[PDB]
Structure formats: C-alpha cells, structure tokens
Design a protein around this ligand. Structure first.
Ligand SMILES: COC(=O)c1cc(Cl)c(O)c(S(=O)(=O)Nc2cc(-c3ccccc3)c(F)cc2F)c1
Ligand SMILES: Nc1ncnc2c1ncn2[C@@H]1O[C@H](COP(=O)(O)OP(=O)(O)O)[C@@H](O)[C@H]1O
Lengths: 1023, 262, 93
C-alpha cells in the first residue's frame, strides 16, 4: 500500500516541514513544466530564472535519469526551452516501458565537486528503520546496499546524534561531519513525522555555502492519512512509467474513491479472448497464474482485484465498464469471460448477483454478436437464486454460459476454457474447546456466527464471554445459543470486562482502522489476553510495528492485521472465517481432521477449506495471517505450533510473492526442525510475465528443491494434497474419524431472506420517499436534483403529495395558498385552543395539536366543501341560474360564497391577489370563470355575498388539478375526494399555530381558567 | 383584556401580519420563508435567510416511511380516519427520541460555544461525563461519503451568510471526532440546529439576549414539525389513494410475557 | 420478536388479562378498580384498594367547565367535530 510520490511534492514537503539548526539553501526554488506552460506566468513567478544557470529533469518516477541523457545540466532559460523542444510531448523507450514525457522540473544549478556528493537513504523493515549513508554519491554509486554505512534504528526509538558521529560518519571528511549530523538527525525526525517508508537522496551536496538537496525519491504510507493529512496537504501519487492509462481505468479508480471498497482495473491487452471478473484480492492472482500457465498468456486482457463487498450499483458500474470493453469489435475466435473467485466475508450475496445479471441483460444484443462464452463459478454460499437467474438469462439471451458449482476447482474452469478438458511467553495451543473470547466492537452478525458454530460443535459453553464497546452505555445483548436465547454482556471500559471475566484468553478486534492500534495498545497491558486478532485492513505500517514490538515485549500472539481470522473446527472459529453455517455444514468444518493450512491472503481461506474438505478428512486448524506488509505472526510461528501439535498430521502453506517469509521453511527443513509433510505453493508466478530470489517462481522452485511437496502449478494442488493423504492413510499414520451428524440450528431470517429461500409479502406499500441508498429520493427525483433546479416548497409539496412534478406557475401558486391561510387571527377557534394549551405550559407539538383537532366540518373545512360543490355542479351542466335557484329551493348555503363585512365595493384584498395571480398565469381557467358568474348572480341580491378565500382556493385547485400539464380528470377528481384540498389548510395554518404557541411562550403568561361570568349553569334540581 | 396576542390583526380592511399588511407581503416577494419569520419571530428577515429557512423545510420534509412518526400516520390512515387525525397521530411522536435532535444540538453546541471551550476539552468531557453528542453521528456515512443534504445546506450557509460562528466551531468538532471513527458526522439534525443558532445571532435584526430565547422556547424544535408535516400529509394522502385496509400487527412479532397466576 | 407486550393475550379461547382470564374476572367481583390494577400493574390488588382507586376516579371526574381542559373540549365540541377529536383536544392540556 506504500505508494510513491513525485520528486517535486517530496521536495516541497521537505522544505515546508524540515526543522534543523544548519540552514538549507534554495528553499522553494523549483519550476513545474507542463505542455500547458504559461511561460509568462512562470516567469512572473520566478524572476531568478533569468539569473543563473538551470538544471531541467523529469519528475515521473524515472530511475537512472543521469544515464539516459535525460538531465539537462547547466543551461540558461533559452537553453532550457531549446532542450525542452525535442522532448516535451514526445516518447522515450525507458528500460522496458514506453510513455510520454509530459511533466518536467527546473531547479537551480549550484556548482559542486565530486567528493561533495553524499548518499542518504532511509527505509522501513520489520525490525525498524534503517539509515544508509555513503560518502560518495552520483550516478556511479553502484550497488549501495552492501557497500554503505548502515545503522539499525529500533521500532519506537530516537536517534542519538553521538551515535551518528561515531558510526555513520567514520569515512566522512572532518569539517563536514557536524553539519551532516545536523542534517540526518533532523531528517529522520521528518521521516518519523510524515510516515514515509522510503526516502532516498542521491546525491547530497554540502559545499561551503550550505546544504541543498538535488534529488528525492520517496514512498509514503497511504493508509496513514488520518494523522498526517493536514501535514500532507494536497498529495498526488504518480503511476509507474508506462503507457497512458485509459479513461476506463480512471473511471474504475474513481470507484475506489467515493466508496469504501477496493477495485482497481489494470488492463494490458484489449484484443484478447481471455477476460476476468474475479472477486477477491487473492484469487485474481490465482487466475492470472493459471491462465498464463496454460499458454493463453497472449490473449489475457486484464487482472483486477475486487473486495470489500461494495453496493450492487458499484458492481454494476464495474461490470458495465468491463462489458463495454467487451463489445467493441469482433475477434473470430471468441472471448472467454471468467467470473468467479474467493471471498471470506459474504455480506452482499444477494446484491452483487443483481449487478452482473443487470449488466449482462443490458447487452444481450452486442454480447451475442461479439461471441462471448462465459464461465461462472460460485463459491461459499449455495445462492441458488443467482445460479437460477444466470441459467434463465443464458437461455433468454442466447449467450452461452456455463454456471458451475463448488465441486469444480477454482482453476478447473481455466482448463475448461483453454481446450484441455470437456464440459460436463509464546504459546503452542492457542485455542482449546474451552476457549472464551471477547469481541471488541459491535458485530452481532459475527458473534451470532460464533455461537451457532459452537452449538454445531456440541460445545458445552459459548465462546463469546463478553463484548466491549466504548461508544454506548453498559447493557446486555440477546443472542441465540442454539434454540434458547442467552444473554451476552456489553461493556464500555475494559476493566469491567476484565474483572468480571477471568476466564477469557482471546480478544478479537473488529475495530476500525483508526482505532485498532489504540484498542490493541489498551488491551496489551493486561495479563490473560494471550491471543489478539486484528480484523481491520489499512492500518499504517508505522503503527503495526509498534504493535509487533509490544507483542514481543509481552508475548501475545497476533493473527493479523488484514486477516479474517482463522478457524479451528470442533473448538473455535474467528470472525467470519468459513462463512455462515450454510458453508460450514457443506465443507464439514464441525469436526476435527488431520490437515492444517496457513495462508497469506484471507480471501483464500474459503478455497482452502473447500479443497481440503474435498480430499481429506477435515481441517485441523487453518490460519490466515493477513494481507499486509507486516504480519503479526508470519508463516514460521504457526508452522512451529503445527509441528509441536499432536493432532496435526500434514501441513499446507499458501504463500504470495514478496519477502523472505518462505526461505525460512527451507532452512527449517534443512536444519531438520520441520518434520511433518508440507505441501506449499505461493501465488503469482506470472507476475513476471507482464529482487530475483523473492519472485514466486524461484521461491516455489527453492521450496521444491528442499523437500516441500510442491505441485507443478496451482491446478494440481488438490491432486497433490489428495496423493499425499492417500499415502498417509495407507501406512497406518492417520486413523480417520467416523463422521457423525451435528445438531442443527434454524437459519437466520435476515440471512435466509437474501439467499431467496423465504418468500413473504410486504406489509406496507409506500409510494413517496426512498430512505436507503446514497441520496434521498422523493417521488421520482433525488434531492440534489431538487436543489439543483429551483423546486421550492411549492414544488416539494406537489412532489410529495401528488407524486406528479408540477410546473412553475402552479408551484408559485401553491406557495400563495400557503402564504394566505397562515393566519386569520387569534380569536379563531383553532388559534384559541392553541393559545390555551400554550398557556397551560405544555410542548410545541401538544400546543399545535390541540388547535389542529379543531379543523373539521365547521372550522377550516370550507375549502373542501367549496370544491365538492362547484366542481360537482360544473359537471352536471347547470348554468348558474338553476344552480342558485336550487340552492334556494333545497335550502342550503353555498359553501364558497359569503363574507361577514365585505362587498363588491370593497373586496378582500387576498382574494384579489389570488384572482389576479390565477388570471395572469394559468393557461385556461374553467370553474373560476363559472364561479365568478355566481358571484354576480348572487351579489345582485345582497352586497356581502362574495366567494371567499375559502371558496377561491377550493376553486383554483380544482382548476389547477384539471388544467395542469400532468393529470387526468379521472385522477384529478381523486385528490379532491381524498381531501388534499382540505390538507392545504392544515399545512397553511400550522405556521400560524406554531406562531401562537411560540409567541405566548415568549410573552410569559400563566394558566388560563375561563371566568364564571360567561357560563350559564343549568343543573336539574334533584338533590 | 384576557389574551394578549402579538402576531396578526383580524379586523380592518386588510389582514396584517406582525408589522406588514398582506398586500405588502405579496407586493414584495416575501415567500413562505419570509411569512414564517414574520409570524414566528415578528422580526422581518432578509433574503439570504428567507431562502435558507425554505431549505430547512425542503430538507426535513421526509426521511422515510419506516420512521416512527410516518409509521403511525400510515396506521391511522389505513384505519380510515381523517387527514387531521392521521397527521396528528404521527405528530405526537415528535419529542425526545424522534425528531428532537435539532433542539438538542442547538442547546449543546451553543451552550459549549459560550463557555469558551475549544473543541478538545469539549470532546473529552463528552467522553468523561459520558453522553453522546446530539449533533454528531450517522448510521452509514463517512468523510469519504457525506450526506448530500448536509453538503447542500453547508454550501448554502457558506455562500450567503455574512459571518458563521458556531458552524466554524462545529466543523472542527467533526474533524476531531471523525479521526476516531469515520461515521461520526454532524447530521442534518445537527446542522440545522447549528445554522439557526448562527442565523439568529448573525441576522441583521436580533440581539444575543433575544436570540437565546427563540432557541430556548423551542422554535428550532418547531421547524421540524412544519417541515415533516408536508411528508405526513403526503403519507396520509398516498395511502388513502392506494386503497388499503385495516392494519393489525402480526402475532409473529410479539413475545407475550404474562405472569402465571390464574 | 419485535414487540414485547406483557398485559393481554388475544388468541386462545378466552381473553386473558395479566394473569387472569376474563371469566375469572367476572366470576369474582374484580370491578373496574381491579381491572385497572390488573392491566396497569400486572399485580392483582386486594379489595380495600380496589375500592379506593374507584374513589380516585369518582373524585377527579370533573372539577368544572371553566377549566383549561374542559374549556378546549367545549370549543372543539362546538366546532362540530367527533368525540375522539373533542376528548383529545382537552387531553393535551
Ligand atoms: C462479493 O462476491 C460475492 O458476493 C460472491 C458471492 C458468491 Cl456466492 C460467490 O460464489 C462469489 S465467488 O467469488 O465465489 N464467485 C462469483 C463471483 C462473482 C463476482 C461478483 C462480483 C464481482 C465479480 C465477480 C459472480 F458474479 C459470480 C460468482 F459465482 C462471490
Ligand atoms: N541541480 C543540479 N545540479 C547539478 N547536478 C545535477 C542537478 N540535478 C541533477 N544533477 C545531476 O543529475 C544526477 C541526478 O540524477 P539521478 O536521478 O540522481 O540519477 P540516478 O537515478 O542514476 O542516481 C546527479 O548525478 C547530478 O550529477
């Protein structure tokens, strides 16, 4: 994970945050040159460019610049520009790769002699941080590893300047000693404060003028941003010097950014017949081994890791990118897409199959006429719905798929693709069967997976004794021990869980990567914790060595970081290793066997359980030591435990390319320390087919020459395990166990719902909002589109209530209807009994509410009576004279029309503003052109009979719901008859009633009893 | 006089709000965001906050149907009753565990802003005395992926308010909190209760000794009621349209515990 | 199970309160003062307190109409609305 940074950004981080006594010349004196060079702006930036000679050189992680002739030395501004004429934008064949030189750097030349060129290099190893010094530098330094002054600096230490004076400067000149000790003792402090891993300066120049830095090569720990991101400021990591990255790779690298997943795409041959869709950081390496091992290496297209279980839409985006790269043009052989792999944490089994199915069924046209023959293999859960939907879409589209099962090996499909086969202190015993464990963090799924595994193992007691979680209060959590519900206590500070439970000896950190170091350093101080698993990935490599240091000062064995944990069948399971019991009962992990495995990658612990279950009696214990650079315990510690264990009868080792972690097995067998039969194979032989002894090919061959039963490739691994186990049975060595059926728990509902075994209908059916997802969605629109446009409250209202999006002339109108019905006054029945229950001291909700239940049939319900009168009489065809005559004859008052004070000579002003807004903006107004006639035919008898605001809102919503752009009359009757138009009054007047509550809570007034002067008591006199 | 009401004025030619007649309200462009400040505060509000309080109503309109208030509006809308009696049966859920995170975030950040505590001792006392911070904490989202509603509200606050104390405070508390867990973000329930504190202090027309009072009464509680009531009229109206029957809860979800003395 | 309710029991032959079936409630003379203690407390109550809690309901039945709750039940009963919506508008006082 330790990525590189550029020479420029490295030097600016050096100049901005180094602190030392002896000053450093040339601070902030550099010039970045692009093909977008505004030379005017740069020359305005740096007037010293017209002052001295310059050195121009590329900054693209190009090693050995000084021998490729790519370093312009000792040039003026015009000389620099002429040196940049034949290069900037052109190509250079550098080493093996070839790319465009698109970024250059200009620095001041300062003269120096040959003995003034020093070498400084600081890197990280597992036991500490080296310091390499050498008195000669330059490009003729040669191999500087075994030829310099080395100094070991231990983990979590300081750097004594006297030690540098006495050991690192024994060949340095005398007068230049003290300034270099003034420099290096500063620089390491810089090295410690920014979490670098590799900082190399060659040459280092100290003249009489002072110290200034010419070159810089640096790699930073990219997982350590959460401390140093203020220090880092803006940091850019450059790619290695190769061809240009497609925008496709940028689009997939963008899926790394905003998500929590990990999915990078490195495509190298777009015209191949072999493609990959591989889930897991480990299994992509395995397919890239086996594909290139079967001679189809010239047709391999990409290899890409995929982990973290992202959402279904991000896997859809990844798969639509790769299927968009599938269907560009035709090759006459036919493209083979390989889908399958190995995950340890099965969390989105229901989601990820909904992505890739949707990516396939959105390309059934082009995928047939580019002739794709897909091989899909499942691992882990028996997710039968995904296999069925693949099998149905393969018959519906016509795309020849071959969905397989767990019975075929994970590289058996590659031979089915490339034409090779037809198509059918320290402890020894960590975990006993009386082992307790404390789960740090809250992981009720993982703890339930503990307890159900333990009940399948016929275990007497549980294996989670207590949980610890410091960000809630102390309580207990209710789980399932088999069928009976038991409780597990959840604590806040660890002293409670470590004083009330003296029985635990394993703790399992499910912390975040920000808290794993702190929680582990909290735990290490205690005594009985004798095994710590650290699940979280992405712990910075400076923190991990501190944990390893204190783990050696206390003796506590660490399995992790970046693991998923191990599994010891019949005794104890860790984390989510082996998956849910749907995998456990199939790979037969509830009884002890006689085989032990151990792996680098935690993703392959499913595949090794699979293969060792389909050949031998069962796994005794299999441990994933995690996929980081600094494991808590390497291969050899667990191999020594497996050697010093009676029940172990054979050992399997799964390695990966990188490091001396595998030659210690050769030394342990040549010393005779490791006796038991060992079958190893490390993944990644064909990494070289895209340091020499740390390659996977040579490590496998050195294990094979030293007495480790290595197969010829990965596809013979099951065969070689089976062929060792047969010879172990046929010599009286292993006496296999008579397999007995286990007890059986019921499945979880929340797990067996995702797999599609349970089918119950949904109780509610809501059709407005959408809680889950990235953004909240209203009826059609996400909220960033609501604020992207100017929807307003008048548009959010129509968008929630009607589910139909409304145009602007009605969007502003319904805001008019809320601005009008906000208050009519305080001596009004609803506002009266909000005033009373606001004086009686109670809440805002309870004072709003006590006025809201006045809305009804005599107060505020004139609106939905005016609509249901005018719109009912509009449709029956009655011209207003017979309407007014029947309202007299049948004897009922017209619900829209009538006002207490006002006449034609003096209207309401609110009804004039609403009427003017209706006429200016609605395209067609029936039923208000009707009702204004009823004003005149009514008001020629009394002046005060006007249609009110309670009549005009109930008319203009009828006219708006009919004559908006998007409704129908048979649907716009329904929002009237439900009572939406009643509900415009509630939302209007509720502003006023919150007003009256708030106002009379401010004007601090007391409890209100009504006077006796207003009440006429009438009581029937029979005492 | 028995009552003393200080907002509206019934009688006369025109209806008058707290200062303004309604033809002046529609003569200018006051908006619902201005009629709101004109009724509740009785202080007339400028445009950059008039549009902001419409943002706070457009955000808290719905969070969803599987939410305690919307749940018991859905139930009393299926039981056949009115709009008022279906709105109301979800409004009496607003309180101290649902929807009352707003006026707890205001009364926490504004109380700790005035006592002078720089955020490290604030977070350390929220650990030591042992209480969760009422503005801060989200179920899913991190620095790497925020709420989008909190980004739209934060961008609108920065682009238009002239001076924002107590949100420049609280965004520091995001970083000092979120460097321990990623999912500790100040919510929308925290940012509305912060930006109204900052608006009532730094509007053109209030005083600090008066802008404490509209926080302590519970106006900022009441912005949630008026926001969410649009959604609850939505849920009533929607499930009166989708003609669904009476709802009894299943027996499969209820664990009866009865003391056995017959 | 999502809810955990500890008072009644719907299913079966007879409805059961907190311990007692209803034919035992009417078989003895439990009264409203005993059904009250049997629902609310889940503890069965003796007769001298069973009659007492009926006294406490017979006393707090009314204090009068010029009283803040009864006032805003009178108002929302004059505004034409239901029994529930008129009870309620005086209960939130
Ligand atoms: C997170 O991955 C799972 O959720 C999962 C679940 C099961 Cl059940 C499973 O078997 C595997 S797998 O890696 O073993 N095989 C496999 C893998 C993918 C895939 C899925 C996503 C991206 C690329 C490939 C696929 F689409 C179909 C497959 F069969 C993986
Ligand atoms: N500013 C400069 N002044 C003088 N010489 C320089 C300057 N920059 C680069 N050089 C020359 O270029 C070389 C630096 O290139 P470098 O990347 O260190 O080569 P290598 O990778 O082979 O060590 C040095 O040997 C130095 O002689």
């Amino acid at each position: 994970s330790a990525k590189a940074i550029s020479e420029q950004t490295g030097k600016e981080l050096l100049y901005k945050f180094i602190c030392t006594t002896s000053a450093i010349q040339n601070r902030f004196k550099y010039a970045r040159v692009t093909p977008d060079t505004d030379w005017a702006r740069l020359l305005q930036d740096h007037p010293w460019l017209l002052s001295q000679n310059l050195v121009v050189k590329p900054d693209q992680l190009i090693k050995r610049r000084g021998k490729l002739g790519l370093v312009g030395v000792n040039l003026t501004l015009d000389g620099v520009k002429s040196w940049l004429k034949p290069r900037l934008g052109q190509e250079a064949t550098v080493g093996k790769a070839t790319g465009f030189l698109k970024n250059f750097l200009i620095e001041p030349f300062v003269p120096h002699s040959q003995a003034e060129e020093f070498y400084v290099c600081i890197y990280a190893t597992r036991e500490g941080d080296y310091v390499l010094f050498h008195h000669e530098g330059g490009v003729d330094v040669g191999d500087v590893d075994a030829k310099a002054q080395k100094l070991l600096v231990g983990v979590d230490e300081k750097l004594n300047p006297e030690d540098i004076k006495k050991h690192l400067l024994v060949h340095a000149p005398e007068d230049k000693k003290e300034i270099l000790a003034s420099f290096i003792s500063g620089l390491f402090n810089f090295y410690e404060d920014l979490y670098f891993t590799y900082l190399e300066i060659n040459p280092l120049v100290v003249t009489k003028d002072g110290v200034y830095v010419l070159d810089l090569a640096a790699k930073v720990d990219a997982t350590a941003d959460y401390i140093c991101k203020v220090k880092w400021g803006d940091i850019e990591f450059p790619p290695p010097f190769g061809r240009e990255a497609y925008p496709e790779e940028a689009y997939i690298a963008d899926l790394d950014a905003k998500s929590g997943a990990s999915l990078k795409l490195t495509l190298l041959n777009p015209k191949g017949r072999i493609w990959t869709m591989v889930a897991g950081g480990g299994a992509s390496v395995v397919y890239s081994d086996t594909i290139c091992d079967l001679g189809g290496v010239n047709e391999l297209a990409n290899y890409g890791e995929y982990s973290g279980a992202p959402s279904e839409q991000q896997t859809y985006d990844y798969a639509k990118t790769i299927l968009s790269l599938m269907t560009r043009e035709k090759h006459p052989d036919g493209k083979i897409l390989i889908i399958g792999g190995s995950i340890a944490n099965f969390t989105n089994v229901a989601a990820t199959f909904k992505g890739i199915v949707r990516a396939i069924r959105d390309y059934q046209g082009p995928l047939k006429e580019h002739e794709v023959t897909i091989f899909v293999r499942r691992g882990g859960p028996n997710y039968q719905e995904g296999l069925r939907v693949m099998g149905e879409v393969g018959k519906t589209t016509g795309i020849p798929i071959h969905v397989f099962g767990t019975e075929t090996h994970m590289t058996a499909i590659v031979g089915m693709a490339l034409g090779h086969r037809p198509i059918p202190g320290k402890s020894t015993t960590l975990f006993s069967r009386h082992t307790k464990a404390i789960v740090w963090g809250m992981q009720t799924r993982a703890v339930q997976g503990m307890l159900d595994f333990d009940y399948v193992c016929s275990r007497d007691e549980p294996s989670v004794a207590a949980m610890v979680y410091p960000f809630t209060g102390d309580h207990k959590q209710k789980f399932y021990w088999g069928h009976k519900e038991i409780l597990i206590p959840v604590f806040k500070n660890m002293a409670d869980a470590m004083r009330k439970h003296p029985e635990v000896d394993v703790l399992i950190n499910f912390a975040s990567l920000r808290s794993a170091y702190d929680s582990t350093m909290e735990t290490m101080n205690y005594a009985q914790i004798r095994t710590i698993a650290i699940i979280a990935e992405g712990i910075p490599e400076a923190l991990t060595r501190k944990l390893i240091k204190k783990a050696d000062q206390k003796g506590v064995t660490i399995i992790g970081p970046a693991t998923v944990g191990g599994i010891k069948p019949g005794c104890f399971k860790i984390g989510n290793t082996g998956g849910m019991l749907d995998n456990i009962l199939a790979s037969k992990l509830y009884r002890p066997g006689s085989v032990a495995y151990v792996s680098r990658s935690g993703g392959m612990s499913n595949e090794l359980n699979n293969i060792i279950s389909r050949t031998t009696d069962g796994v005794y214990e299999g441990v994933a030591i995690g996929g980081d650079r600094y494991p808590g315990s390497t291969f050899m510690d667990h191999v020594l435990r497996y050697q010093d264990t009676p029940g172990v009868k054979m050992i399997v080792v799964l390695g990966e390319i990188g490091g001396t972690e595998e030659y210690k097995i050769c030394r342990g067998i040549k010393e005779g320390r490791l006796t038991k039969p060992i079958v190893c194979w490390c993944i990644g032989t064909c990494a070289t087919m895209f340091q020499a002894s740390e390659t996977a090919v040579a490590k496998n061959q050195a294990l094979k020459e030293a007495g480790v039963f290595v197969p010829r490739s990965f596809d013979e691994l099951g065969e070689i395990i089976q062929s060792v186990y047969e010879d172990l049975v046929a010599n009286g060595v292993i006496v296999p166990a008579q397999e007995v059926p286990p007890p059986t728990v019921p499945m979880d509902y929340s797990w067996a719902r995702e797999l599609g075994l349970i089918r119950k209908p949904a109780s509610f059916m809501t059709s407005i909002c959408d809680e889950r997802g990235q953004e909240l969605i209203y009826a059609g629109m996400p909220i960033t589109e609501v604020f992207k446009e100017e929807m307003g409250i008048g548009g959010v209202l129509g968008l929630l209530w009607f589910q139909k999006r409304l145009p602007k002339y009605s969007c502003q109108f319904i805001e008019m209807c809320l601005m009008v019905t906000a208050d009519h006054g305080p001596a009004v029945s609803g506002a009266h009994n909000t005033i009373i229950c606001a004086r009686a001291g109670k809440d805002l909700v309870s004072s709003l509410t006590s006025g809201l239940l006045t809305i009804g049939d005599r107060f505020g319900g004139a609106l939905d009576a005016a609509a249901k009168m005018f719109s009912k009489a509009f449709d029956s065809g009655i011209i207003p004279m017979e309407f007014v005559n029947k309202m007299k004859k049948e004897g009922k008052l017209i619900m829209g029309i009538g006002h207490r004070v006002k006449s034609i000579n003096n209207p309401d002003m609110r009804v004039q503003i609403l009427k003017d807004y209706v006429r200016q903006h609605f395209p067609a107004t029936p039923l208000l052109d009707y009702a204004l006639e009823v004003e005149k035919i009514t008001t020629s008898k009394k002046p005060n009979l006007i249609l009110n605001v309670d009549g005009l809102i109930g008319v203009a919503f009828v006219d708006m719901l009919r004559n908006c752009g998007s409704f129908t009359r048979e649907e716009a009757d329904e929002y009237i008859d439900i009572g939406a138009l009643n509900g415009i009054f509630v939302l209007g007047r509720s502003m006023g009633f919150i007003g009256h509550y708030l106002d009379q809570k401010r004007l601090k007034q007391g409890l209100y009893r009504h006077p006796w002067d207003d009440i006429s008591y009438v009581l029937p006199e029979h005492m």
